[PDB]
Enzyme design. Structure first.
Site, PDB file in Angstrom:
ATOM      1  N   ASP A  83       0.836  -1.194   0.000  1.00  0.00           N
ATOM      2  CA  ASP A  83       0.000   0.000   0.000  1.00  0.00           C
ATOM      3  C   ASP A  83       0.876   1.251   0.000  1.00  0.00           C
ATOM      4  O   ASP A  83       2.093   1.202   0.185  1.00  0.00           O
ATOM      5  CB  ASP A  83      -0.947   0.009   1.202  1.00  0.00           C
ATOM      6  N   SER A  84       0.233   2.397  -0.204  1.00  0.00           N
ATOM      7  CA  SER A  84       0.969   3.650  -0.312  1.00  0.00           C
ATOM      8  C   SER A  84       1.293   4.281   1.041  1.00  0.00           C
ATOM      9  O   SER A  84       2.088   5.223   1.087  1.00  0.00           O
ATOM     10  CB  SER A  84       0.226   4.625  -1.226  1.00  0.00           C
ATOM     11  N   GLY A  85       0.723   3.773   2.136  1.00  0.00           N
ATOM     12  CA  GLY A  85       1.164   4.096   3.477  1.00  0.00           C
ATOM     13  C   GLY A  85       0.328   5.133   4.193  1.00  0.00           C
ATOM     14  O   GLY A  85       0.419   5.241   5.423  1.00  0.00           O
ATOM     15  N   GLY A  86      -0.492   5.891   3.464  1.00  0.00           N
ATOM     16  CA  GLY A  86      -1.228   6.972   4.093  1.00  0.00           C
ATOM     17  C   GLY A  86      -2.446   6.536   4.876  1.00  0.00           C
ATOM     18  O   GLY A  86      -2.842   7.221   5.826  1.00  0.00           O
ATOM     19  N   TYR A  87      -3.067   5.416   4.496  1.00  0.00           N
ATOM     20  CA  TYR A  87      -4.243   4.944   5.221  1.00  0.00           C
ATOM     21  C   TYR A  87      -3.917   4.752   6.690  1.00  0.00           C
ATOM     22  O   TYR A  87      -4.671   5.180   7.573  1.00  0.00           O
ATOM     23  CB  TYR A  87      -4.733   3.618   4.632  1.00  0.00           C
ATOM     24  N   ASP A 135      -2.978   8.012  -2.015  1.00  0.00           N
ATOM     25  CA  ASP A 135      -4.331   8.560  -2.011  1.00  0.00           C
ATOM     26  C   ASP A 135      -4.702   9.017  -0.605  1.00  0.00           C
ATOM     27  O   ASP A 135      -3.944   8.857   0.357  1.00  0.00           O
ATOM     28  CB  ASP A 135      -5.349   7.509  -2.483  1.00  0.00           C
ATOM     29  N   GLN A 182     -11.740   6.978  -5.390  1.00  0.00           N
ATOM     30  CA  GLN A 182     -12.376   7.500  -4.179  1.00  0.00           C
ATOM     31  C   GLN A 182     -13.737   8.086  -4.542  1.00  0.00           C
ATOM     32  O   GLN A 182     -14.272   7.776  -5.611  1.00  0.00           O
ATOM     33  CB  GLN A 182     -11.459   8.500  -3.463  1.00  0.00           C
ATOM     34  N   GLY A 209     -11.707   3.685  -0.144  1.00  0.00           N
ATOM     35  CA  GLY A 209     -12.693   4.398   0.638  1.00  0.00           C
ATOM     36  C   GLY A 209     -13.821   3.556   1.184  1.00  0.00           C
ATOM     37  O   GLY A 209     -14.809   4.121   1.668  1.00  0.00           O
ATOM     38  N   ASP A 259      -7.650  -8.079   0.129  1.00  0.00           N
ATOM     39  CA  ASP A 259      -6.757  -8.115   1.274  1.00  0.00           C
ATOM     40  C   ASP A 259      -7.603  -7.814   2.503  1.00  0.00           C
ATOM     41  O   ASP A 259      -8.520  -6.988   2.445  1.00  0.00           O
ATOM     42  CB  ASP A 259      -5.657  -7.046   1.146  1.00  0.00           C
ATOM     43  N   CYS A 297     -11.991 -28.797   5.327  1.00  0.00           N
ATOM     44  CA  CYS A 297     -10.751 -28.087   5.063  1.00  0.00           C
ATOM     45  C   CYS A 297      -9.600 -29.063   4.847  1.00  0.00           C
ATOM     46  O   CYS A 297      -9.436 -30.036   5.588  1.00  0.00           O
ATOM     47  CB  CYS A 297     -10.440 -27.183   6.253  1.00  0.00           C
ATOM     48  N   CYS A 299      -6.366 -28.194   4.991  1.00  0.00           N
ATOM     49  CA  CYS A 299      -5.107 -27.656   5.484  1.00  0.00           C
ATOM     50  C   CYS A 299      -4.406 -28.652   6.405  1.00  0.00           C
ATOM     51  O   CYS A 299      -4.998 -29.621   6.891  1.00  0.00           O
ATOM     52  CB  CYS A 299      -5.316 -26.310   6.181  1.00  0.00           C
ATOM     53  N   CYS A 302      -6.032 -29.160   9.912  1.00  0.00           N
ATOM     54  CA  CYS A 302      -7.244 -29.969   9.952  1.00  0.00           C
ATOM     55  C   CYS A 302      -6.978 -31.427   9.613  1.00  0.00           C
ATOM     56  O   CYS A 302      -7.783 -32.297   9.971  1.00  0.00           O
ATOM     57  CB  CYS A 302      -8.313 -29.363   9.038  1.00  0.00           C
ATOM     58  N   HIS A 328      -4.616 -22.288   9.604  1.00  0.00           N
ATOM     59  CA  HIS A 328      -5.907 -22.752   9.113  1.00  0.00           C
ATOM     60  C   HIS A 328      -6.693 -21.623   8.448  1.00  0.00           C
ATOM     61  O   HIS A 328      -7.292 -21.822   7.385  1.00  0.00           O
ATOM     62  CB  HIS A 328      -6.742 -23.353  10.242  1.00  0.00           C
TER      63      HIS A 328
HETATM   64  C1  LIG Z   1      -9.692  -2.144   6.757  1.00  0.00           C
HETATM   65  N1  LIG Z   1     -10.301  -1.262   5.780  1.00  0.00           N
HETATM   66  C2  LIG Z   1      -9.609  -0.621   4.844  1.00  0.00           C
HETATM   67  N2  LIG Z   1     -10.218   0.202   3.959  1.00  0.00           N
HETATM   68  C3  LIG Z   1      -9.229   0.742   3.157  1.00  0.00           C
HETATM   69  C4  LIG Z   1      -9.228   1.722   2.178  1.00  0.00           C
HETATM   70  C5  LIG Z   1      -8.005   2.124   1.652  1.00  0.00           C
HETATM   71  C6  LIG Z   1      -7.955   3.238   0.709  1.00  0.00           C
HETATM   72  O1  LIG Z   1      -8.943   3.863   0.340  1.00  0.00           O
HETATM   73  N3  LIG Z   1      -6.694   3.581   0.291  1.00  0.00           N
HETATM   74  C7  LIG Z   1      -5.553   2.935   0.680  1.00  0.00           C
HETATM   75  N4  LIG Z   1      -4.411   3.334   0.115  1.00  0.00           N
HETATM   76  N5  LIG Z   1      -5.553   1.921   1.552  1.00  0.00           N
HETATM   77  C8  LIG Z   1      -6.803   1.522   2.064  1.00  0.00           C
HETATM   78  C9  LIG Z   1      -6.776   0.539   3.075  1.00  0.00           C
HETATM   79  C10 LIG Z   1      -5.477  -0.011   3.638  1.00  0.00           C
HETATM   80  C11 LIG Z   1      -5.052  -1.336   3.009  1.00  0.00           C
HETATM   81  C12 LIG Z   1      -3.773  -1.880   3.619  1.00  0.00           C
HETATM   82  O2  LIG Z   1      -4.065  -2.213   4.995  1.00  0.00           O
HETATM   83  C13 LIG Z   1      -2.959  -2.991   5.392  1.00  0.00           C
HETATM   84  O3  LIG Z   1      -3.256  -3.781   6.505  1.00  0.00           O
HETATM   85  C14 LIG Z   1      -3.352  -3.033   7.717  1.00  0.00           C
HETATM   86  C15 LIG Z   1      -2.663  -3.925   4.218  1.00  0.00           C
HETATM   87  O4  LIG Z   1      -1.259  -4.097   4.087  1.00  0.00           O
HETATM   88  C16 LIG Z   1      -0.681  -4.995   5.022  1.00  0.00           C
HETATM   89  C17 LIG Z   1      -3.225  -3.170   3.006  1.00  0.00           C
HETATM   90  O5  LIG Z   1      -2.219  -2.820   2.062  1.00  0.00           O
HETATM   91  C18 LIG Z   1      -2.113  -3.691   0.949  1.00  0.00           C
HETATM   92  C19 LIG Z   1      -8.018   0.171   3.625  1.00  0.00           C
HETATM   93  N6  LIG Z   1      -8.293  -0.686   4.687  1.00  0.00           N
HETATM   94 ZN   LIG Z   2      -7.987 -26.232   8.205  1.00  0.00          ZN
END
Ligand SMILES: CNc1nc2cc3c(=O)[nH]c(N)nc3c(CC[C@H]3O[C@@H](OC)[C@H](OC)[C@@H]3OC)c2[nH]1
Ligand SMILES: [Zn+2]
Ligand SMILES: CNc1nc2cc3c(=O)[nH]c(N)nc3c(CC[C@H]3O[C@@H](OC)[C@H](OC)[C@@H]3OC)c2[nH]1
Ligand SMILES: [Zn+2]
Lengths: 362, 362
Positions: A83-87, A135, A182, A209, A259, A297, A299, A302, A328
């Site tokens: 991710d870009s880090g700002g969230y 973003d 967004q 978003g 994710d 499952c 895995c 299990c 699991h």
């Molecule tokens: C839980 N709800 C949720 N809504 C989201 C919405 C956005 C969004 O609009 N923009 C950006 N840039 N990131 C978002 C994110 C963070 C994803 C990252 O959260 C990280 O986990 C904490 C994970 O990386 C380990 C992932 O990066 C790939 C969101 N998370």
């Molecule tokens: Zn399992």
């Protein structure tokens, strides 16, 4: 030799699609779940996540680069998405401006700015294969005016992200860049955002978003109109989603990539996912239950151990219990994605989604 | 078909021995390290431990029996050794008498008595293959009078343990019973205890009452005279020991079997064992160290991941880091035991012990 990036749709059912992303480091089958790399030893998932925000603070992106990049550091030779880090800065850390965001590290007090240019450079130093544009994840709820101003800034930042990515030769030639839509819950703003991103041009498009407190009905309503606005021939990534039922419904609405912290967070807190819904394994009703976590499952957990033993380990404070639960849960999510891919390919996804819900919520 | 119990010495060097214990559920190579079963997924160690004291309190021995016994419960088809449960009652829980000890459970307030007869029955319900006599681990330091009174009670309890074990047909025919020598640091009391145990007759003999605060020099001094008092043709088990250097010195003094919480406790607390001594992986000096935990270790962790990555995981709060550390530590201890067995068999154990110490303490 695989290309830098190529997405091919093999089969469709309604809005659902199944296919493959080819990249230099491997093929990604879609719809895909992308687990965190650090919660368990993940085996060849097709792609794992790096936690950009955490890595920026410890040990720092420059240090990760000195150690050889995330692939070498984590022992993972297949694709990595960051991710870009700002969230998380807005979530966990701030002062905002058109330039970016500044914030202080709780770990040691150091100062950090994050801008489109710096976010792209951080992801370059980490070595990730799929890079997200920088973003602003608009808070929920948001008024139309604030959602619009926020989205407009994100679109300016998306262009700056594109330009920063294209300026770094190794990145432009070997990685891929996704833009993030967004617009909060507003159809007209979602359309403006999609149009702006397609005009810039990205390798894939994320729906940003969401999963920020709106609830599943509202999320699905926004997906209903938002996903068709994105280019059909590119992958669609729903950020932050989600529970198994969120994933099924999002695939029904055209999402290709997911994710979510749930399977790893749940595993550390006694929650296991099953085809009959989640269970909290610490509950006393599992103390004598000789069945595996899930009856179907495949895995390794299990195949070998009972609910009763995993309950015992967790109740005794043994980290082994949480590790088995996490392994699991990751495996369950991958079996879910495999069933989704197979059912779309075979033209029975509508029936699968109906059967899945009837049993998961029974 | 293997016998109920048969110990054979294949080679000797000084007081050190290497050989095999044959039991119905498998062969145990000696000198042996016996890890806890619940701290990691242990693969076919030759024998694992069950924690009798914990299992008595959660879920209870009767419940373990209802679930099929520890072998089924833990998914381990090879031998299991259990302690008699009183060490931890005195350590973690009390009212003592010639009958046994009574204590209250901190988990739920329930009452529990522990006697020789009840301890043997608990170990029967757990299904363990090597059963320990119910003894009193004398506190350290102890006066000669108190050490003698304590040892005398333990010898009366050893006879009661023998009789209880022999009364249960399935246990007498399929398990083995070890007696435990007491006597604190006093040669005459150690001799009286050894004589009493040999007169009763056991399948193996443990040196009890050590690793209770006396320090390595004193422990070795007590082993110097205590181990030769036990029957030579039976295995010798040093309870609670120990660090790698404790193990090497105890093997030099005739010990065949070991258990210690160190590798699993250390792994949960950032300590890794290496041929150059223990390291605390959380220290900043490992943040950029690309070497494996140990340069010679053949474990799966050292084949794949660096000190820097394991440091990162633990510092980030990821349970994966502690699990990898624990798996390495168990594997290191087993590689140590293999080197000990090979060196005794080859007549180079004296040289190995010298080389080991020079490097471990360098
Ligand atoms: C839980 N709800 C949720 N809504 C989201 C919405 C956005 C969004 O609009 N923009 C950006 N840039 N990131 C978002 C994110 C963070 C994803 C990252 O959260 C990280 O986990 C904490 C994970 O990386 C380990 C992932 O990066 C790939 C969101 N998370
Ligand atoms: Zn399992
Ligand atoms: C640390 N020092 C230490 N000195 C000891 C001395 C004695 C002794 O004289 N008698 C008995 N019966 N037990 C002893 C024990 C406990 C061993 C158990 O301790 C358990 O770990 C906590 C382990 O089982 C998971 C093992 O049982 C096989 C000792 N521990
Ligand atoms: Zn290792």
């Amino acid at each position: 030799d695989r290309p830098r990036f190529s997405f091919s749709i093999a089969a469709r059912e309604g809005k659902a699609r199944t296919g493959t992303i080819e990249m230099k480091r491997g093929v990604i089958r879609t719809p895909a779940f992308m687990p965190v790399g650090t919660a368990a030893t993940v085996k060849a998932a097709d792609i794992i996540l790096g936690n950009t925000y955490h890595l920026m603070l410890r040990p720092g992106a420059e240090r990760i680069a000195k150690l050889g990049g995330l692939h070498s550091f984590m022992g993972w030779d297949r694709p990595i998405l960051t991710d870009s880090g700002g969230y998380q800065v807005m979530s966990l850390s701030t002062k905002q401006s058109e330039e970016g965001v500044t914030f202080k590290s709780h770990l040691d007090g150091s100062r950090h700015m994050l801008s489109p240019e710096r976010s792209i450079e951080i992801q370059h130093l980490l070595g990730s294969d799929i890079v997200m544009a920088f973003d602003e994840c608009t808070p929920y709820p948001a008024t139309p005016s604030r959602a619009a101003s926020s989205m407009e800034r994100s679109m300016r930042w998306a262009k700056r992200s594109r330009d920063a990515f294209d300026s770094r030769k190794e990145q432009a030639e070997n990685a891929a860049l996704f833009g993030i839509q967004q617009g909060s819950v507003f159809e007209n703003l979602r359309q403006q955002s999609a149009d702006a991103l397609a005009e810039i041009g990205f390798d894939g498009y994320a729906v940003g978003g969401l999963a920020v407190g709106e609830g599943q009905d509202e999320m699905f309503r926004v997906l209903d109109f938002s996903v068709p606005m994105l280019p059909d021939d590119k992958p669609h990534y729903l950020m932050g989603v989600g529970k198994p039922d969120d994933i099924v419904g999002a695939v029904e609405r055209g999402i290709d990539m997911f994710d979510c912290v749930l399977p790893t967070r749940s595993g550390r807190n006694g929650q296991a996912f099953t085809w009959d819904g989640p269970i909290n394994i610490r509950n006393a009703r599992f103390s004598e239950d000789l069945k595996p976590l899930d009856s179907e499952c495949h895995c390794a957990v299990c195949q070998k151990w009972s609910r009763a033993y995993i309950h015992h380990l967790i109740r005794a404070g043994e980290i082994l219990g949480a590790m088995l639960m996490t392994e699991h849960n990751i495996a369950f999510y991958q079996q879910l994605m495999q069933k989704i891919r197979d059912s779309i390919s075979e033209g029975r996804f509508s029936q699968f989604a109906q059967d899945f819900r009837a049993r998961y919520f029974a």
